[PDB]
């Protein structure tokens, strides 16, 4: 009665348990095992270990479900374990490697105290610069972090209407994934994404390489300035969760000054509702995640009407659950209009 | 279009909770800012929780809400959290004293951040400590006395009678624990058979707490406690020679030191005992293995293990008794003897 208490807090309290996995993405592990490594002998010179060591990583990986001895010094992947394999469609070795963003930017967890007692972010204390300011540094992070953001836009593009749409401008919008979706959804449509360095490279390229350079280009700029033209459709798809309230209303006010007389700002974001249930876990992980990695946040429709009011905009509407293929967690796009 | 199925939804929440670091960093928090004895000294409300923590409030609530999500905290009236079950365990006064096992700004849970580097302990077999925080961990320890006591604190949680029953002390006068903490071991043995002497070896400040604890407990007048380095010639002979929790601390090389050590101080007919788990919960047994790996560059071992190591020393492993207590791990008891 009491030990199991005791055996879950320490089992919710483990800090080993996630940088095993962690450790076993950026290893490589499932890839080397599905390769023909089956043996520690072989993972460890595949993957450059000490033998001793990799198996002592292995007794844990199996202990928690991702590993399996089929026949005696040979290790296979479970259901679950599988998943770490580096094609698979959910990604999530890539989203587990140290060497990657998202993992390295977890990190910031390590000071979370520091960041409740604040509320502002640990990643700079990390790593010496902010987020954003870090990846503009590090080609290989904007990299990894650009093609994590595409883990294919179906449902959030066909949560609007675009007959009167002449034009969409997707401020933030990493490789053009939404605006390549808007594209293919109406053929009437053309659309400008307007990114960072290094992420408008990869834009104009899955760009090109969808067919569609001939209907989306791609600018590069900074969206708390004055954005590069006008258009009916401004979308912030997972942007305004990067920000704290000021910076939002900023991002706001900049789309707002840029929109055709009847034109609409689309937020697509995940807006954390009270009852979700099972749902909380990874609802609280973005958020937790937005704070110590930005200091943004995830919002209530009551928040959004605010920060709409504080950038001259109303919130219309609010489009169902969107449901993505490989996420664990379902969005919904806000429809904003002048106030 | 977007299918999602379920059964590969599933795995992908498994392993999202497997890999996630902030749940782990959130109950670390919870305990380090002694929320649970907060609320329980009368703190309901996140404004007064906040105010007791010196957080921000809105982020105390984003934090209570994982810990809401995670089964610690409940919300029993609005703006009003309480601790679960499991959760009341964070009680600082709860006899696991598993609050200070996560207490971020104690030995252990600070140690734990080791984990963060698992790759480089796996590739190259030895800790991550030293790189994270300048010195070795023990060593680190002699330069900060509150780690120092906060490690012993914490090592103290029986009290030994377990293992104690498990030696037979008729031929034994005199009782070396090496190593020996604060004295638990040789108070649980002078307890238990009152013509045996004891002498503790422990490091500077251990001594201290050593001493005091083994003067309250009514047994000064039979437990000594000497300041020393257990890789040094020991200060005296003795017919039992204790090293509870100790050589997994160590790999081989230093184990094989300290056993020698032993070995050269052993009264004729004396024993070595050895106390710890011998590698064979998997879960529970990969922490304690993979946390000396990190930590210290140690290992549990199993019996054949013991056996390489005992010769290496000039020992040989006479028998091993398994003791059972109510924590998650059992211990078992090793006794070597002189080829
Ligand atoms: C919340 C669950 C979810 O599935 C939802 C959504 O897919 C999403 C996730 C993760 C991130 C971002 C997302 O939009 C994101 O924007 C972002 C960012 O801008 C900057 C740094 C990290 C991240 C980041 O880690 C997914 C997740 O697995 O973990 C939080
Ligand atoms: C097997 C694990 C066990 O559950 C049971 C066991 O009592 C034990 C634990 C923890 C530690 C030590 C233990 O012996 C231990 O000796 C030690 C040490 O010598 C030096 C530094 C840290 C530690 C340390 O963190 C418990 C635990 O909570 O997980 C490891
Ligand atoms: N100051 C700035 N100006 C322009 N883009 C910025 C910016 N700060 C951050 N960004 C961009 O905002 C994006 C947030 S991630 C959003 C990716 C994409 N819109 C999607 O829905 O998947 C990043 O790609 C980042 O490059
Ligand atoms: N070089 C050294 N000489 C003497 N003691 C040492 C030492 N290096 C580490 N130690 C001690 O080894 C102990 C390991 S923790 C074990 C404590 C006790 N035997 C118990 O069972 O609870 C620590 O108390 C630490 O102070």
């Not at 800090?15 to 002998?41: E, F, N, Q, S």
């Not at 997972?238 to 789309?255: E, G, K, S």
Request: aromatic share 6%; charged share 25%; with cysteine.
């Amino acid at each position: 009665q009491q030990i199991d208490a005791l055996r879950t807090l320490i089992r919710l309290g483990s800090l080993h348990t996630p940088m095993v996995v962690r450790t076993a993405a950026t290893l490589r592990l499932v890839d080397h095992i599905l390769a023909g490594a089956r043996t520690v002998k072989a993972l460890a010179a595949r993957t450059d270990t000490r033998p001793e060591a990799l198996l002592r990583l292995i007794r844990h990986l199996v202990a928690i479900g991702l590993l399996e001895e089929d026949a005696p010094g040979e290790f296979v992947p479970t259901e679950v374990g599988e998943l770490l394999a580096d094609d698979h469609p959910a990604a999530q070795r890539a989203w587990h490697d140290l060497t990657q963003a998202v993992a390295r930017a977890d990190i910031s967890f390590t000071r979370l105290p520091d960041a409740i007692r604040t509320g502002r972010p640990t990643y700079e204390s990390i790593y010496g610069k902010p987020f954003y300011e870090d990846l503009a540094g590090r080609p290989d992070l904007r990299a990894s972090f650009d093609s994590l953001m595409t883990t294919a836009f179906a449902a959030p593009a066909a949560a609007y209407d675009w007959t009167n749409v002449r034009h969409v401008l997707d401020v933030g919008g990493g490789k053009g994934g939404f605006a390549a979706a808007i594209a293919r959804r109406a053929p009437h449509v053309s659309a400008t994404v307007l990114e960072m360095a290094g992420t408008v490279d990869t834009a104009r390229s899955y760009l090109k390489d969808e067919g569609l350079s001939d209907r989306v280009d791609v600018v590069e700029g900074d969206f708390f300035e004055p954005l590069p033209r006008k258009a009916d459709a401004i979308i912030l798809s997972f942007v305004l969760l990067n920000w704290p309230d000021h910076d939002a209303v900023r991002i706001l006010t900049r789309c707002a000054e840029a929109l055709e007389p009847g034109g609409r700002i689309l937020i697509h974001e995940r807006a954390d509702v009270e009852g979700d249930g099972a749902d909380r876990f990874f609802s609280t992980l973005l958020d937790l995640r937005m704070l110590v990695f930005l200091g943004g946040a995830l919002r209530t429709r009551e928040k959004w009407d605010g920060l709409a009011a504080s950038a001259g905009l109303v919130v219309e509407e609010v489009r169902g659950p969107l449901v993505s293929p490989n996420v664990p967690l379902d969005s919904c796009l806000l429809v904003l209009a002048p106030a």
